[PDB]
Scaffold this active site. Sequence first.
Site, mmCIF file in Angstrom:
data_model
loop_
_atom_site.group_PDB
_atom_site.id
_atom_site.type_symbol
_atom_site.label_atom_id
_atom_site.label_comp_id
_atom_site.label_asym_id
_atom_site.label_seq_id
_atom_site.Cartn_x
_atom_site.Cartn_y
_atom_site.Cartn_z
ATOM 1 N N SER A 1 -18.656 -37.487 13.080
ATOM 2 C CA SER A 1 -17.809 -38.219 14.001
ATOM 3 C C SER A 1 -17.755 -37.504 15.353
ATOM 4 O O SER A 1 -16.796 -36.804 15.674
ATOM 5 C CB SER A 1 -16.403 -38.433 13.456
ATOM 6 O OG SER A 1 -15.768 -39.480 14.186
ATOM 7 N N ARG A 2 -18.811 -37.681 16.134
ATOM 8 C CA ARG A 2 -18.958 -37.065 17.434
ATOM 9 C C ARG A 2 -17.940 -37.555 18.456
ATOM 10 O O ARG A 2 -17.289 -36.722 19.108
ATOM 11 C CB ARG A 2 -20.384 -37.268 17.974
ATOM 12 C CG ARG A 2 -21.497 -36.834 17.022
ATOM 13 C CD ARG A 2 -21.450 -35.349 16.759
ATOM 14 N NE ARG A 2 -22.505 -34.847 15.890
ATOM 15 C CZ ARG A 2 -22.506 -33.615 15.378
ATOM 16 N NH1 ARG A 2 -21.505 -32.791 15.662
ATOM 17 N NH2 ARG A 2 -23.485 -33.201 14.585
ATOM 18 N N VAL A 3 -17.808 -38.869 18.646
ATOM 19 C CA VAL A 3 -16.886 -39.379 19.652
ATOM 20 C C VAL A 3 -15.430 -39.136 19.258
ATOM 21 O O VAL A 3 -14.536 -39.139 20.108
ATOM 22 C CB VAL A 3 -17.067 -40.868 19.986
ATOM 23 C CG1 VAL A 3 -18.486 -41.175 20.436
ATOM 24 C CG2 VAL A 3 -16.648 -41.761 18.829
ATOM 25 N N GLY A 4 -15.189 -38.966 17.968
ATOM 26 C CA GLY A 4 -13.834 -38.723 17.474
ATOM 27 C C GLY A 4 -13.460 -37.251 17.669
ATOM 28 O O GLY A 4 -12.303 -36.940 17.944
#
Lengths: 466, 467, 466, 54, 128, 128, 128
Positions: G117-120
């Site tokens: 979960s990069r954008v998170g």
Amino acid sequence: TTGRIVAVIGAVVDVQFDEGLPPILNALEVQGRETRLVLEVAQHLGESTVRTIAMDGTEGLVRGQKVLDSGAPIRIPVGPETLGRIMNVIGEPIDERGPIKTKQFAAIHAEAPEFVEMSVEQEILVTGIKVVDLLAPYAKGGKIGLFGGAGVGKTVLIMELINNVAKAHGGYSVFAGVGERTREGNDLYHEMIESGVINLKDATSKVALVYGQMNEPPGARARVALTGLTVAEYFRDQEGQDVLLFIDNIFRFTQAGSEVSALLGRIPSAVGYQPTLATDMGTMQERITTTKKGSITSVQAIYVPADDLTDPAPATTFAHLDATTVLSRAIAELGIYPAVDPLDSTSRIMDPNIVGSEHYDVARGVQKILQDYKSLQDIIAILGMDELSEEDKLTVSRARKIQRFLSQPFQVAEVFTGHLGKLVPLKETIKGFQQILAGEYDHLPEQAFYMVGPIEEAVAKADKLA
Amino acid sequence: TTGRIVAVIGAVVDVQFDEGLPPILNALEVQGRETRLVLEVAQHLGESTVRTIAMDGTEGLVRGQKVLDSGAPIRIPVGPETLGRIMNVIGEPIDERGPIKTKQFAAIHAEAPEFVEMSVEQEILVTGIKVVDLLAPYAKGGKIGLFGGAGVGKTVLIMELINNVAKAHGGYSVFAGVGERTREGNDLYHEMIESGVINLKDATSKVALVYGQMNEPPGARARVALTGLTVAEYFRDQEGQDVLLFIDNIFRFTQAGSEVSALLGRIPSAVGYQPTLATDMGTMQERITTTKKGSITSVQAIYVPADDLTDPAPATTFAHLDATTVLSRAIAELGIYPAVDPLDSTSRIMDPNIVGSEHYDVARGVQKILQDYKSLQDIIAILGMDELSEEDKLTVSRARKIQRFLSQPFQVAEVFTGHLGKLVPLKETIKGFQQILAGEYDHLPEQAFYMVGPIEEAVAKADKLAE
Amino acid sequence: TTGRIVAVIGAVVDVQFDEGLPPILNALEVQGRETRLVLEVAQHLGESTVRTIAMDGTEGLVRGQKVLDSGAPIRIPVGPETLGRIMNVIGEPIDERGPIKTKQFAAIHAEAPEFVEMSVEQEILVTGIKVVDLLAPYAKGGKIGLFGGAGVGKTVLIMELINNVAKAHGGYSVFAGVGERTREGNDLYHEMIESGVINLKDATSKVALVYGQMNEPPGARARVALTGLTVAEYFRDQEGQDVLLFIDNIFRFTQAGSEVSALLGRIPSAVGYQPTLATDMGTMQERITTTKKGSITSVQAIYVPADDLTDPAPATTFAHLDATTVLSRAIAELGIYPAVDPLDSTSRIMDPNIVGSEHYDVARGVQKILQDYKSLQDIIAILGMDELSEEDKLTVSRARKIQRFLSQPFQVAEVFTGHLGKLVPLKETIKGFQQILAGEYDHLPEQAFYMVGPIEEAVAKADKLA
Amino acid sequence: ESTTSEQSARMTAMDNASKNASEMIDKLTLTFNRTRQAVITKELIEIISGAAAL
Amino acid sequence: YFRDNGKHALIIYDDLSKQAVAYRQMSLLLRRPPGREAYPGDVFYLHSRLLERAAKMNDAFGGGSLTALPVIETQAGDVSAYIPTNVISITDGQIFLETELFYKGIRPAINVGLSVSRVGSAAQTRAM
Amino acid sequence: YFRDNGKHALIIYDDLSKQAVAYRQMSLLLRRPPGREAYPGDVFYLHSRLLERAAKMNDAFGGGSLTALPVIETQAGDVSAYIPTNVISITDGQIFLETELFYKGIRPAINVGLSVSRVGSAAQTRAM
Amino acid sequence: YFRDNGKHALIIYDDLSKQAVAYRQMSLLLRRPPGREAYPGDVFYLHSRLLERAAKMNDAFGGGSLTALPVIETQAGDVSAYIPTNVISITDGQIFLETELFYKGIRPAINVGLSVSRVGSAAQTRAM
Ligand SMILES: Nc1ncnc2c1ncn2[C@@H]1O[C@H](COP(=O)(O)OP(=O)(O)O)[C@@H](O)[C@H]1O
Ligand SMILES: Nc1ncnc2c1ncn2[C@@H]1O[C@H](COP(=O)(O)OP(=O)(O)O)[C@@H](O)[C@H]1O
Ligand SMILES: *N(C(=O)NC1CCCCC1)C1CCCCC1
Ligand SMILES: [Mg+2]
Ligand SMILES: [Mg+2]
């Protein structure tokens, strides 16, 4: 003159013309719509009726609705005015910055350059990425393809390439989002403004954007690539210079076509694809090319359905590339990025008379030890390494060190890895791989070679191992 | 009656008849052509229109072209006048030697012999080929099939058998070239002139030739087999005397049928074949048989698509045979020729009561040591050999020797092996395989058994190998 | 009104009516036949013609033959007079015992209970069967998948569940044989009569049987489960009972549907099943639940094609199962009856929030000790028992005692064993094992817990002689 | 000393080998079912395509 | 005839594989919908009504019987193919034969591990 | 033209895999019902017909000739598939190349057991 | 509605595997050309247009958002199947659940190695 809608099924719309039938490929304008709805003539069905493909939603269309022949194929804006701007399939601005005031328009359809216009000059394009430069080098003005299954790294790779080539490029670039993520388009747009390659205050922009993402209906996604490449064709000729063309993801072109084909009446081909798969791809790809008039260096991300490279889409794409970078899921799971399969990635430039015999021999050497290790892996799976001859243990060891030295931290991934990105010069890449092959580091631990730049960093890391 | 072509799609032609409508199977002659173009009636579509398959190319045909009903199915020359000659699907000479001056003609479509016409007698036909004579011996007047994927040895085996059985043969032979290589037909033809099996000057020819190769359109490949067996039937019935019938390759009959099936309007069956594969095959195969009137020893090469014997074509063919010789790519790839699979070849006469329990037991013993090695192979390839007992590994070494003693230098194959052809007597085969099984050669090296004739040559090669 | 036959193609018949067409799913009665021929409407083709699927052979039908619309879907007798009787898809008695004199009839097609009609409660349906109740409890209104074909005591498990549910819940049962082999249908009938669950003399029968024999056309085999489902809905809705519905076997329900779908010309789905695989299963299974009035609990024999649990058939069925009962040879060969696998069998309601913390903890304990015992099998085999640590040695004794206490004599089998069956109340079961785990019986011999009811019966059997 | 090292290393090596085998078994089996399902589906779509074209 | 007149008959169907192929031919050419392996949706029904006719009658019916031994040809040992699957589930049990067993010396080549008879024990004499 | 005018020519078809895909396209668009693997039921005849045209002529016919080297692209090294076996069943041999050998240093990457020549030493000088 | 009025909403699609089988059912009955696993060529699009509607709006558009938790069911952990691979390439990351972790007590059964979960991660509290 005007025609009328006789039938509607998804993106496919049939239109009858009492007078003057519009030729195949012509763009028609549907009347009574709040926003421009284009229909592209696909075929003449007979009885003064034509079958067309809509470039946007067909909800709200009614049998009897009026349709206008524009007298030509879809035409879009081209020239210096496209730079820093974002457009859609049909040339409309989608950045809310007003009209694109160009002096020139061009049809997104056109015949591919002729045989007499082909170029035969072969010159390397050093990326600073070890695997690529060593094993399957890219070429200036050549066609590059990045194959990969879901979430294996295609986008990260194309972005690193934009970061390593597009920025240090004198000319212009075209980025085409085809059937991918809209927010990736938003990130890209804001990233380029931050770095100044796009400027909303002056005329210094160096990149032109074209987007038709996964929120779009089939007809649009089936044509956005034509739109993008049409902008690049202009810079290629109508300026006689060097152009970079980036596309994520050209697979979506074939998938979109598969969606309408199911409605155009065609009998399906293998795996449910359109029977015209190869020729549809052919008339499009053959335009993405360098000519004697100017060069286009193209980088196309290519999705691989279910991780099956024999899937008709990908399998037909190989024939169009000058260099192929095949990403592997098994490699990525080993932590090795970029996840490039060193034995399934090729370049038409890997020739002693082009890259030199030292470079040539070091690549063959690496691939040789990797293949020998591969042939062993079967016997290692059950019994393991401890059962190998004191000699095979050696190829295993060097091979595993080579597999990790092919790995490398990217600048564009810094934001999540936490490791400074690296760019290794071609001369440094050959050397490093020579030394491993010659045994100069048989005494260094594997982990020392993983995720570093040049050879010196491997030794240093082998020291911090106290 | 006169007809008019109303439609042309590839090899399938629709003709319209104003008056008389020709019955299914009748031959129609197309008017206005440089060379004889025959159409065979397959169906009556209705509205006085019939659907047909052409026996030669359809390029040049026009809608409205006149067609005549010959008032009968394709009829060809049969009898002693066909010997030494080459005919095509429709009985025309293709050897540039003129008319086939026969006194009788015969339809290529015929009912199969009744159940009361069958014969049960069965005697051994020794070939001189060690694996065949030993494991799945052929029978005189029996049906023999040679199965094989592309390029594994079918034709080389049939050419060898013609050399070892048909030269000596005192009766007559028929060779049907069915959808195979034209080059092979020119080869065979000159081969036979040399052996005097065919004589262009006197009338001592003992073989009749019929050809319809892969250069021909599907209609011709779908009926040439019938043409050839029609010739053979005359010898069997109108002369009784023993007949040899060789067909390369009868699969091509089934493939031809599938090339036009969809054009004939059929819904495809499994694997893209015509729904009539089995019945089509039955009414043809049931004619290739010995009867009380006379004997036919048939040898048919059988193509196996994609190397898969479960393919409907080859799979429906096992039931029409008395002896099966199955060829394998996995074996050919190892240099083992003939590439016969010893664990997948069978014979109705492999019975102790027919061949004697010595013949039966050795064959059976060879099969057991081989199945046992095969079951062992993958295990030792992982855990090594050291874990086997001295006896378990003594079978591993004899198994490999036996596998090698099954290979053989074919006379016909000299241009490939670089070795002088060899012919081994039945008794010598049994003896040799028996001795290896008994251990009487555990001290000779494997390669001594590779590519030789009789067991003596193995001993002699071993000597030649020592120093 | 009356229509006429216009087409007969195997088990598919097209009927034409000049007036009002019968709605899809309506039952049609063919006239002029020795035996009753029923036709279920499948589609409205247009031109006032319907397409039906046949419930029996279609030989002898003529074009023109008269057909009556019964005005509704297939209706069968429902009520107490169905118990002990054998019926077919269309409700006719096939036991030669005369008419099924019920006061009511019911349509075999029906919508599942509405959202508001649902019971937000989750209660265990006690079976009196120790292995089940403790370790993998049946939930009221839930679905149980019964694995293990013949030879593992299935028929006796079925009969005893019937008996027990009648004792402890006042609820009746229904046996739906989907694709019953006639030979086995005759034998099941006589085994039930012999076991008492069926009585040909008085009205004390506890089970209603419905057969869809293997030699009937696809349509009948596809609808029988509905028939038996409808008989059981009667006991839930009109008598507020907690019913038991056996479906042997649910896979043949899917195959019949697949065959019906094939015959109607519908394009097949993955692995060749009907496109409606999930809705065919859904519109049926959903009728089995706990309403405000009562509940239908269903035990379903499941055949797994090619032993592949991922095959579409079993995969679709698993979406509805709340627990499983796995019967095995291995356990049968150890003499533990019922031959339930204590670690392979499971239940969704094996949760503290549902069966309570006491039940859950005891269960989890037995599972662990059975696991720990299975883990010691190695160290004991090659090494010796006289080497395990005191803790281990004891877990081997408690475990073995545990596995014996899961055994249990059935009433249904009193005619063959001569021993009295046992219906063990849940609280007694939970406690019995709790005491073994506690170690309150470490001073007794294993064979004391083999084939008994309540824990007390273990202590007694011990006293015997010595 | 030698036999103690040898028997403990053969034990260890054979533990691994056996565990690798089982894992391989579990994977090939799952690969087998995926393939089994795709052949049927594949062979059936092929029949339908031919039939529909008529 | 025997079954219903107080006698016993044994019928052998060699093989049902070829019968199903002929039925398929006729269905495809009558243009009935093709399914798995191109067989019609009623091919199961074809064999089920045939094999149910085998049976053991009671005394009131004469006590006669009719026993059936259907034969199915598998391809490369695939017992999960369509026709095989149908006939395996119809029948009361199966005798599986194997090639590997056969060439190894085990003849008859019966796999005692998988072969089964649901009737089992009830059909054999005390001695056995 | 050469073959029949007393001369010798060599032809390379690079490649027939792609020619078959185009044939399949054109055939399906003509509404000819697809066959195995979606190809026209006559893909074999597409290629057999063409390659038979390569031949050695006799002196009476000028003694000229045409030699052909068709090319087929496999998928995952599967020489045994349908398209590939079709073409092999036409030609007078085949040269099979594998990626494993190519990477080990065996170049030309020929697999000896799987390749063959159906003319043999009759196409070689005595020396060779 | 919330997304466009400066508020925030969370949507769970439990599950999309079943939605995709339902759509496959609609497509096959419509006689659309079945592809991989018999899904229509537009199954990708079925989910792409849907999940593209989960978004984060800038302040000029009210600052609202719509967060989506699509659920996908795999078979024997096959995350390379068609549907799963489609959705992986739609969404912004994945939370993988594993039977063995679950059947061992690790609950939640999250595979921390695969899950991403990069954008998170960029939108996570400093404290955490
Ligand atoms: N070069 C890389 N370095 C580190 N992680 C990477 C790299 N490439 C891909 N990844 C990992 O894989 C994920 C998916 O990459 P992405 O390019 O978005 O997939 P896709 O191939 O679908 O375009 C990234 O978020 C990251 O976690
Ligand atoms: N008995 C044999 N000995 C040596 N080489 C053989 C033998 N049989 C076949 N071959 C080799 O394999 C090639 C293909 O065999 P052929 O009989 O033509 O195959 P097919 O089964 O395709 O008809 C031959 O030309 C030769 O090169
Ligand atoms: N050749 C063959 O059978 N003809 C000759 C062989 C030498 C003795 C006389 C007859 C074969 C034809 C097929 C290909 C292989 C050679
Ligand atoms: Mg991406
Ligand atoms: Mg041949």
